[PDB]
Amino acid sequence: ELLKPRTLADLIRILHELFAGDEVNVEEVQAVLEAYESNPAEWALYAKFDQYRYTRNLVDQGNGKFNLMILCWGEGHGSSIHDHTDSHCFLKLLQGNLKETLFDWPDKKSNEMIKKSERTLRENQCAYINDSIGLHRVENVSHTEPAVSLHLYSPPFDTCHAFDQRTGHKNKVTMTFHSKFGIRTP
Numbered sequence: 001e002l003l004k005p006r007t008l009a010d011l012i013r014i015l016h017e018l019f020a021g022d023e024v025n026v027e028e029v030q031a032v033l034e035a036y037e038s039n040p041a042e043w044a045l046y047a048k049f050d051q052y053r054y055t056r057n058l059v060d061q062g063n064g065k066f067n068l069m070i071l072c073w074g075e076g077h078g079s080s081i082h083d084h085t086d087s088h089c090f091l092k093l094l095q096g097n098l099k100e101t102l103f104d105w106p107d108k109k110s111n112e113m114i115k116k117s118e119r120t121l122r123e124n125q126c127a128y129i130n131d132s133i134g135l136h137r138v139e140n141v142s143h144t145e146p147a148v149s150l151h152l153y154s155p156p157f158d159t160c161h162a163f164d165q166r167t168g169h170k171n172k173v174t175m176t177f178h179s180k181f182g183i184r185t186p
């Protein structure tokens with residue numbers, strides 16, 4: 001019985017219930033993420049920015065079944081074109097806006113990766129991606145407003161691939177946490 005999360009802590013409790021089993025009801029997870037109304041005071045602890053690139057801040061390690069983290073995007077900060085390592089990936093905006101650009105999986109032939117579409121993800125909206133849908137790039141294109149997003153991945157993963165937009169060639173990247181549970185982890 002999906003109820004509206006009252007707070008971030010409540011959302012986390014609800015997520016532990018939704019991931020109690022072996023499968024994932026994507027539409028339910030997306031719905032409860034969207035229903036949480038971002039309250040900056042509840043997540044300030046995790047919103048640790050870096051001047052030069054976006055940061056990944058672990059919030060909850062789940063139940064063996066999911067990571068939950070907050071990403072902090074300075075003005076002009078963005079990601080590579082990347083995959084999600086056979087995991088579900090939910091992205092909910094907590095503050096600001098992000099541009100999501102979708103790409104198809106490249107062919108073996110070296111070729112420019114042409115965007116398939118783009119959209120603007122706005123505060124409180126929750127997007128979903130997985131490798132069957134495609135690849136994406138996420139960017140804070142704002143010149144004046146930092147963005148903060150809440151990401152849930154299931155199963156957890158700590159590596160993915162970055163794709164060269166000019167060729168489609170991929171390289172494996174290991175993702176690192178800037179902080180965990182509010183503690184900076186250099």
Ligand SMILES: N[C@@H](CCS)C(=O)O
Nearest residue numbers: 056079089091138175
């Ligand atoms: N998956 C990316 C962020 C955009 S979804 C990352 O984990 O760093």
Ligand SMILES: [Fe+3]
Nearest residue numbers: 082089136138
């Ligand atoms: Fe992503």
